[PDB]
Design a protein around this ligand. Sequence first.
Ligand SMILES: CCN(CC)c1ccc2c(c1)Oc1cc(N(CC)CC)ccc1C2c1ccccc1C(=O)OCCOCCOCCOCCn1cc(CO[C@H]2O[C@H](CO)[C@@H](O)[C@H](O)[C@@H]2O)nn1
Ligand SMILES: CCN(CC)c1ccc2c(c1)Oc1cc(N(CC)CC)ccc1C2c1ccccc1C(=O)OCCOCCOCCOCCn1cc(CO[C@H]2O[C@H](CO)[C@@H](O)[C@H](O)[C@@H]2O)nn1
Ligand SMILES: CCN(CC)c1ccc2c(c1)Oc1cc(N(CC)CC)ccc1C2c1ccccc1C(=O)OCCOCCOCCOCCn1cc(CO[C@H]2O[C@H](CO)[C@@H](O)[C@H](O)[C@@H]2O)nn1
Ligand SMILES: CCN(CC)c1ccc2c(c1)Oc1cc(N(CC)CC)ccc1C2c1ccccc1C(=O)OCCOCCOCCOCCn1cc(CO[C@H]2O[C@H](CO)[C@@H](O)[C@H](O)[C@@H]2O)nn1
Ligand SMILES: [Ca+2]
Ligand SMILES: [Ca+2]
Ligand SMILES: [Ca+2]
Ligand SMILES: [Ca+2]
Ligand SMILES: [Mn+2]
Ligand SMILES: [Mn+2]
Ligand SMILES: [Mn+2]
Ligand SMILES: [Mn+2]
Lengths: 237, 237, 237, 237
Amino acid sequence: ADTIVAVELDTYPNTDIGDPSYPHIGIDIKSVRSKKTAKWNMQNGKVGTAHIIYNSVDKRLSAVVSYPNADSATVSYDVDLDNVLPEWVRVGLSASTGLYKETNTILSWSFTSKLKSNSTHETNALHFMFNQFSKDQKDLILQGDATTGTDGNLELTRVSSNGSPQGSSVGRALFYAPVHIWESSAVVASFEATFTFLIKSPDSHPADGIAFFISNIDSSIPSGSTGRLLGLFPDAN
Amino acid sequence: ADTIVAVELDTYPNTDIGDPSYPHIGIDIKSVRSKKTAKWNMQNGKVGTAHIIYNSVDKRLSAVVSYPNADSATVSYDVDLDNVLPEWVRVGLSASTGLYKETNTILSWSFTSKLKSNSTHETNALHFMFNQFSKDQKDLILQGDATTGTDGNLELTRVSSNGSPQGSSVGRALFYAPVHIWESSAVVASFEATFTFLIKSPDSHPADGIAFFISNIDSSIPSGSTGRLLGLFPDAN
Amino acid sequence: ADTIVAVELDTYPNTDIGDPSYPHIGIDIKSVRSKKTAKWNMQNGKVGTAHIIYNSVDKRLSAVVSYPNADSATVSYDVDLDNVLPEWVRVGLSASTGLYKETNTILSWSFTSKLKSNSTHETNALHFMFNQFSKDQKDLILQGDATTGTDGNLELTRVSSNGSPQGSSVGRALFYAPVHIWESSAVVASFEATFTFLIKSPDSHPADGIAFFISNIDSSIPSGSTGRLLGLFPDAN
Amino acid sequence: ADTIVAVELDTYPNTDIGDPSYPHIGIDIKSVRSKKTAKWNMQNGKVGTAHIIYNSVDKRLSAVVSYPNADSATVSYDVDLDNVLPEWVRVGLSASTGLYKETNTILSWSFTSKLKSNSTHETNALHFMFNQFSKDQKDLILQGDATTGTDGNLELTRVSSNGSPQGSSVGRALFYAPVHIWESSAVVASFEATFTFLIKSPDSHPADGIAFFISNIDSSIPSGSTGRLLGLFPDAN
Ligand SMILES: CCN(CC)c1ccc2c(c1)Oc1cc(N(CC)CC)ccc1C2c1ccccc1C(=O)OCCOCCOCCOCCn1cc(CO[C@H]2O[C@H](CO)[C@@H](O)[C@H](O)[C@@H]2O)nn1
Ligand SMILES: CCN(CC)c1ccc2c(c1)Oc1cc(N(CC)CC)ccc1C2c1ccccc1C(=O)OCCOCCOCCOCCn1cc(CO[C@H]2O[C@H](CO)[C@@H](O)[C@H](O)[C@@H]2O)nn1
Ligand SMILES: CCN(CC)c1ccc2c(c1)Oc1cc(N(CC)CC)ccc1C2c1ccccc1C(=O)OCCOCCOCCOCCn1cc(CO[C@H]2O[C@H](CO)[C@@H](O)[C@H](O)[C@@H]2O)nn1
Ligand SMILES: CCN(CC)c1ccc2c(c1)Oc1cc(N(CC)CC)ccc1C2c1ccccc1C(=O)OCCOCCOCCOCCn1cc(CO[C@H]2O[C@H](CO)[C@@H](O)[C@H](O)[C@@H]2O)nn1
Ligand SMILES: [Ca+2]
Ligand SMILES: [Ca+2]
Ligand SMILES: [Ca+2]
Ligand SMILES: [Ca+2]
Ligand SMILES: [Mn+2]
Ligand SMILES: [Mn+2]
Ligand SMILES: [Mn+2]
Ligand SMILES: [Mn+2]
C-alpha cells in the first residue's frame, strides 16, 4: 500500500472517521483521520485558492484555503518528511464523490521544491506551473476519472456533458517526474504548492473533497477509495 | 528609534545581556536580548551559509546556520509581522566588532519576498541575488564601515590592507528598494533570505557577529551600536 | 540629457516626425524616431499584453504586443547595451496624451534581469512583479501625472473621476532600485519585461501611447515631452 | 527517426562531414551538419559554461560557451520551433568519444521553459536545476553509458576507475518529464539552458564533444552514433 502525506479540502463531514461536523481543511499523515483540522467556510460554486508550504527548518507543514473577500482557513502540523516519505516522491491532486457529489475542477496548479545539500549554494530545484491544462497534458499522469478538457481545466472527478457532477467518482493527476523531496545531506529541504479550484454542487450537500498529496513514486488509486477516502487511502484506519 | 526584526549569528557571549555562554544563533524581535537561541559551533575562517525563512501561514520565523560536513544550528519563533513591522520595510545585513574583533565578510546574499492579496493569484514579488559585489554596488545602501571591494565581497566591518580586522567597527548593507512585507488583504505573505559569510579572527576570541535584519525603511545605525549591539540596537534593553 | 532605450506602443501617427501612418510598436534608441517599427492593430478598450526581451548572446532587443485572440505585433533590433546605456540604469513605464487622449492604465508589470560574470554560475539577478498596485506603492518612483489608484491599477496619465482620460498629460513609473544591466565581465546579460495595459479613448483617434523604457538612473520627464514625445525625449531629433 | 534540435560543443574536426578544421560550437537542426558554427577555443581540463537561449519573439536560437577569463564563443540561427519539433519534447545532454576521447563530465545543468497562451498572463512553465547529481537521479533518463557518480557529477561517457576517459562511448541524460515547447496559441514560447562541463583528455586530440538537445519524447541513442555523430544522429546526412 502507498505512503501518503496530504492536505485535504474536505467538503463532507464523515464523523464516524473523526471529521468535525462541518467542512474543514486538514493535514493527513498516512491516514484519512486528519492529524489536525480547521473549520472551512466552503462556498458552493466560487473559485477558491489553496496554498501548502513546507520547510525543513521548522519541520512544519502548513496550508491556507481562501476565497476573495472571505476570511481564510489555516492549519499547521509537525512533519518530519524524512520520517514519513521516501527520498523520492510524486506530487499530485486527488478528489472524490460518493453518495453525494460535486464538481472537483482545478483551474491552475503550481509547485516548487528545493533541496540544498551539504554545500553553500548546492541547491537542486524543481518548479512547474499550469495556468491552463491542455487536452493532451503529457506531463500529467491521470488516474481513475480525472481528465483535462478543451476548456483548459483539470476535472479530477467525472462531470457529465451538461456540466453536472457524478457520484462514486475518484480521479487524480500527478506531476510526471519524480521529485527529490528530502536527502540526508540537505541543510534545507522545502516546497510549496498552490492551486485554484471550483467546487459546485446542485445537491444541497456537496461531497467529498479535493486534496494535494505527496506519495511514493508508484502511488495509484486504492481500490474502493471513492467517497470519504478521497482517492488517497485504502481504508478508514 | 528604529523597529528591528533580526536573525543574529552571535560570535561573542555577552552574558550580562542574556547571551548563552557559547556562540549561538538567535531570533531578535525589537531587542538585542534574543527571544530564542541555539548553540552554534562557529568555525573560525571557514565559509558558512545562513538561511532565514518566514511564512505568514504558520507565522513562524526560522533560521539555519551551517558549514559543509558539519551539523546545523536551527532556531524558530512565533512572529506576527503585522504586529511588529510597518507594512513597508528595508532588508539588510549588519555586523560589528568591539574590544574583540573578526572579519565580517559576505560572499553572497539573496532575498525573495511574496505577497498574495485578496485574489486567486494576485501576487506581488521581489527577488534579488548577489553572488559577487561590485565596487560601485548602486542597489546597496552602505552604512557605517561597510564597503564592497574589488575582490567581489561585501565587508560589513573594517578590515585593514593586510586583511586583519578592526575593533570598534559597525557597518550595514540594506537592499536599495523598500519591500512590501505584509499587507492586511494578503492571504500569504512570506520571504526567504540566504547568505554566505566568512568570519576570521587572529584573536583566540572572535567578536561580535553578523545579522540579517528587517527594519523600518529609514533605519540607520544607532549611535554607539558597536560590540554586542551588532549595529542593530541603541541599548541593551 | 537622458539616455533612453524604449519599446513604444504608439497609438497616434505623427507622420511629420517619422511615424508610419498607423498605430505601431517601435524600438527607440536615444530618439523618438524609431529604429524599427511594426504595424500595430490597437484595440480600443481591451486589455493587451506586451512582452519585451533582450539577451547579450544575440544582442537583439525584441517586443511583441498582443490581445487575446488577435494576431500579434512584433519588432526586433540589434542593440549593444554596453554601447548605448550606462552600466547602471532604472527601468520604467511612460505614457502621455496631447490634443488627443486615452487612458494609459497598467494592470500588471513584471521585470527580470540577470548578469552572469566571468565565472561559471556567478550571476546577479533582480526580479519584481506587480499584479496589483497599492495607494502607497513605495518601490515605485512616480513622475509627472502617474498615480496608483483605488482600483489597484497604475494610471500613467490623468484620468478624471468618471474614468475618462485627459489631454496634455504625462506620467512615468520607475522601479525604485537601480539595475545593473551590463558589466564588461559578463558572459551573459539579459532581461525581460511584461506588462498588461488598458488603453481606452472616447476620441476617434486615441493618443499618444505607452512605453517601457530603460534610462540613466536620474532620468526625469523632459520638459515639453507630453503628446508625441511620450514622456521620454526633449525634442523630436 | 528522431527529430533533433541541438547545440553542439564539438571538440574533434571531422572535415569530411562538414566540420570546420577546428573545435567549434554549432547549431544543429535535424542533421549533424551544423547550420551555423563558430570557432571554439576549447580548453583541456578546465571547467567551462554553456548557455543556450531561445525566444519565439525573434525565433532565434543562440548559444555561448565560455571559460573564466577567456573570450567567449557564440552562435545564433533562425529556427521556428513549430516548424522543426513536435509540440511536446524532451530535453537532454548527449556526448560521445570514438577513436579519440575525453571526459564528458557535467557538474550542473539548469533549464527553464515558458509558454504563454492566448491570454494576458496564461503562462505554463517548467524549471529544473541540478547543482549536484546523486547516485540514484530518478528525474533523469540515463541512456547508453551515462552515469551519475560518487563525486556528485554526471559522467555522460565512460570514465575508468582512475578518472581516465574511454573510447567508443556514448551516453545521454534526459529530463524525465516531457516539456511543452510550443503550442499554436502561445503569444511567447521560450527557454534557456545552462550547464557547466569538464572535458579533459590524455590524448593530443580530444574527442568527440557534448551537446544540449531537444527531441521527440521517445528519443533513444541511434545505432552507430558514437564518435562523430555525438549520440544524436543515425548517419552523417
Ligand atoms: C445514494 C443515495 N443517497 C444520497 C441522497 C444516500 C443513501 C444512503 C445514505 C445517505 C445518502 O446519507 C446518509 C447520511 C447519514 N448521516 C448520518 C446521520 C448524515 C451525515 C447516514 C446515513 C446515510 C445513508 C445511509 C442510510 C442507511 C443505510 C446506509 C446509508 C449509507 O450511507 O451507506 C453508504 C456507505 O456506508 C459506508 C460508511 O459507513 C459508516 C457511515 O456512517 C453512517 C453515517 N453516514 C453515511 C454517510 C453517507 O456516506 C456515503 O456518502 C458520503 C458522501 O459522498 C461518502 O463520504 C461516503 O464514503 C459514502 O459514499 N454519511 N454519514
Ligand atoms: C580593549 C582590550 N580588551 C581586549 C583584549 C579588553 C579590555 C577590557 C575587557 C576585556 C577585553 O574583556 C573582558 C572580558 C570579561 N569577561 C567576563 C568575565 C569575559 C567574557 C570581563 C571584562 C572584560 C574587560 C573589562 C575589564 C575591566 C573593566 C572593563 C572591561 C570592559 O570590557 O569594558 C568595556 C565595555 O563595557 C560595557 C559592557 O558592560 C557590561 C559587560 O560585562 C562585563 C563582562 N564583559 C565585558 C566584555 C567585553 O565587552 C566589550 O567587548 C565585547 C566583544 O567585542 C563587545 O561585545 C562589547 O560591547 C564590548 O565592546 N565581555 N564581557
Ligand atoms: C490633426 C488635426 N489638425 C490638422 C488640421 C490640427 C489639430 C490641432 C491644431 C492644428 C491642426 O494646427 C494648429 C496650428 C497652429 N498654428 C499656430 C497659430 C499654426 C501652425 C496652432 C495650433 C494648432 C492646433 C491645435 C489647436 C488647439 C489645441 C492644440 C493644438 C495643437 O497642439 O496643434 C499641434 C501642434 O501645433 C504646432 C504646429 O501646428 C501643426 C503641427 O502638426 C499639424 C497636424 N497636427 C496637429 C496635431 C495635434 O497635435 C497634438 O496632439 C497630438 C496627439 O495628441 C500629439 O502627438 C502632439 O504632440 C500634440 O500634442 N496632430 N497633427
Ligand atoms: C586521424 C588519423 N587517421 C588518418 C591517418 C586515421 C585514424 C584511424 C583510422 C584510419 C585513419 O583509417 C582507417 C582506415 C580503415 N580502412 C579499412 C581497412 C581503410 C578505409 C580502417 C580503420 C582506420 C582507422 C581506425 C584504426 C583503428 C581503430 C579505429 C579506426 C577508425 O575508426 O577509423 C575511422 C573510421 O574509418 C572508416 C574509414 O576510414 C577513414 C575515415 O576517415 C579518415 C580519417 N580519420 C579517422 C579518424 C578516427 O575516427 C574515429 O574517431 C573520431 C574521433 O574520435 C570520431 O569522430 C569518428 O566517428 C571515429 O570514431 N579520424 N579521422
Ligand atoms: Ca469527509
Ligand atoms: Ca553577543
Ligand atoms: Ca506618435
Ligand atoms: Ca566533430
Ligand atoms: Mn476530513
Ligand atoms: Mn546573542
Ligand atoms: Mn512612433
Ligand atoms: Mn561539428
